[PDB]
Design a protein around this ligand. Structure first.
Ligand SMILES: Nc1nc2c(ncn2[C@@H]2O[C@H](COP(=O)(O)OP(=O)(O)OP(=O)(O)O)[C@@H](O)[C@H]2O)c(=O)[nH]1
Ligand SMILES: Nc1nc2c(ncn2[C@@H]2O[C@H](COP(=O)(O)OP(=O)(O)OP(=O)(O)O)[C@@H](O)[C@H]2O)c(=O)[nH]1
Lengths: 394, 394
């Protein structure tokens, strides 16, 4: 009974999961938080949170590996999946990790300095601790590589694209891809003759237009900062405004980068929280700035959904996913009502149902476009890629 | 037979027009270019281009005033209209210019340092040369003041909006308003139950959603830099990308501001021209980068049109206007074809007709949304506001 070890090695943490090869069920999950600081702690699926003083990525993954030994799962690890944040233009699909792949990730690493160097550290660690195990790289950008130049070029001088690689890459590719496949089943659509809009909504939020199985437009850009307004991220912001603030307040680009990434968004407007649950209660309790933050959030999602629809020949489905897209009765209601122009009709009893109801259609029959909620499973999509690449003779 | 003198006092030029009060026909037009430099020249509607060595806004407007004396039009100037670029939050409509209005324009002037201080210079000049004449201020921003907070707030910290005035203002308001009114007649729509998308397309380009007579969304932001890709302007650009370029190339915000405003857009991608006529011929002649510039241009327009449709309850019309929107058979074709998802059907024989055909519907009967071209007349809209305010007892 073989298993897959999925690793998301972030800048401050290491998210891991162990999935059974046969059924793709989660058998174990956890997180190693506070990475590189004096206080680094390992936590396993809600159980006892252990500790490690000033531990790096290699020893933290070794701590996780010790726990796989304890539950006799080490010998069963047949495949390892790595989430990589940025794959540049080089990666269009998931790959078996070799010396070539490592070099290529290093080549595109300047495009995401925070995310990617942590991913490489996770690769080296897993390579050290599991040398006889096939390892797979799954990229957040790869699904969006089917974008046409008209859809990925910025209006900048050509030089920036040709010599520096400045262009739209987009993210949540694993999720957008996973949720796309599930939508063809749920909505009984032909993949080769379909038009979908996936609204991945969480702490990070992005929209994707999936035409005939392929991503044709996405809301995030070169960095995860473009598009929708998010938890702490601003989203689409007038550069003229950003330059105006720079002169007026006397702030540098790196100061504003911090503000736009960690002090903005839902947090920025409300002045209260980046968490929707807190903000939803706040609005119910008559908080005005929380109402505005959520309304602006909703408005920018509706705008990007409708905008990405333009890249489709025909709109068959709108799919909600992510922590917010799966669990927010209100946000889904407000977004769909904001898109009445497209002929959407919501079924509120179906929209009331909690996420325990899993893959569910939330639109009424007279609606021109089917609306649904599909719980995203990024770990399953990584595992499925690994299992596929497990049959490959290298 | 009274006349109206319309003045657009830009940073490098002074565009003027003389319109008859009764019919609103143009009787005289011209431009005073190269303002403040050693070489400043007055040109009148294609006729002999006179000169003036190192002339300021006051003397240049006096040169224009001398020509009004020559053609015996000075005594007939009953009203003067001023185009103002930025009216902040203070101006929701056109006003009779008084000491209060001047102060208020000065108050909001930091929001547009280039545009507004030139507008004030034009006001002072016209006040000096025509003291007994009623003068009117028409603002580029005022039509967009009906925007809801959800539509004008950025995802920045609240402080930037509350204390600094950072928010979406939008521009081309005079044009968007003018073209809106004309569309109700042409499309036989009830103003109070209508949904329009106006695509003002020129060297500067913006989209506006006009719901029930009011602007509810617009593509430009705090500055004219946000939204669509334009002639020399980039449009929507990932700030993360802008910050990345800053570190990599070693450029300041003011360097990048120049690049994004004057070296980007259609010029930036093609590396050839900001003019569409040149680029359209270039593509016909097999130029690849000109094809890409136009395709990216088209894609970003389609995306914003469809996006702004979300702010409408029902989409009755899409209206093209501006130098490009009025004269580009190709761009209109490519944009409408890019919006097939909305159920648009183009009539190509009707779309082939040149601008001499004026206000014209270009969509076929089976189309779900009426498409039209309405020639914009910003001078007429300024004159009509002035004539209205001419009946006002102050
Ligand atoms: N309304 C509501 N919101 C919820 C609920 N549960 C979680 N959320 C929201 O979901 C968000 C977190 O979602 P996640 O998908 O886990 O965010 P993330 O994984 O850090 O971000 P991404 O990896 O980019 O998707 C938080 O901001 C919560 O406010 C819920 O039960 N109701
Ligand atoms: N294809 C095509 N384009 C034209 C034609 N005539 C003008 N244009 C384009 O229209 C653009 C200029 O339009 P304008 O409306 O005058 O631009 P502008 O007034 O400086 O900019 P705004 O004030 O923001 O509207 C140029 O880029 C030209 O390429 C034409 O006959 N055919």
């Amino acid at each position: 009974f073989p298993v897959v070890l999925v690793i998301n090695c972030g800048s401050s943490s290491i998210k891991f999961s162990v999935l059974d090869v046969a059924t793709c069920d989660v058998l174990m999950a956890g997180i190693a938080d506070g990475m590189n600081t004096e206080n680094a702690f390992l936590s396993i699926n809600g159980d006892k949170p252990i500790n490690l003083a000033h531990s790096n990525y290699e020893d933290a993954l070794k701590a996780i590996a010790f726990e796989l030994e304890k539950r006799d799962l080490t010998d069963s690890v047949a495949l390892i999946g790595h989430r990589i944040a940025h794959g540049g233009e080089l990666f269009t699909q998931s790959v078996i990790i070799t010396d070539e792949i490592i070099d290529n990730i290093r080549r595109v690493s300047p495009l995401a300095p925070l995310h990617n160097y942590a991913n490489l550290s996770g690769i080296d660690a897993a390579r050290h601790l599991f040398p006889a195990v096939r390892q797979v790289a799954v990229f957040d950008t790869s699904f969006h590589q089917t974008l046409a130049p008209e859809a990925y070029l910025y209006g900048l001088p050509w030089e920036y694209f040709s010599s520096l690689g400045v262009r739209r890459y987009g993210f949540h590719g694993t999720s957008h891809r996973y949720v796309s496949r599930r939508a063809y089943e749920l909505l009984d659509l032909d993949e080769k003759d379909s038009g979908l809009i996936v609204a991945h909504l969480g702490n990070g939020a992005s929209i994707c237009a999936v035409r005939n199985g392929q991503s044709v437009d996405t809301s995030m850009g070169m960095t995860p900062l473009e598009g929708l307004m998010m938890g702490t991220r601003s989203g689409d912001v007038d550069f003229g405004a950003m330059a105006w603030i720079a002169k007026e307040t006397g702030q540098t680009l790196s100061d504003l980068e911090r503000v736009v990434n960690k002090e903005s968004g839902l947090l920025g407007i409300s002045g209260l929280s980046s968490d929707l649950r807190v903000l939803e209660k706040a609005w119910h309790e008559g908080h005005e700035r929380a109402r505005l933050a959520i309304k602006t959030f909703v408005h920018r999602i509706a705008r990007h959904i409708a905008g990405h629809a333009a890249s489709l020949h025909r709109l068959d489905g709108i799919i909600f996913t992510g922590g917010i897209g799966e669990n927010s009765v209100l946000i889904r209601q407000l977004v769909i009502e904001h898109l009445g122009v497209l002929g959407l009709t919501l079924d509120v009893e179906m929209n009331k149902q909690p996420n325990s109801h899993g893959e569910r259609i939330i639109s009424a029959n007279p609606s021109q476009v089917i609306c649904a909620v599909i719980p995203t499973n990024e770990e399953k999509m990584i595992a499925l890629d690994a299992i596929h690449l497990g049959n490959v003779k290298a």
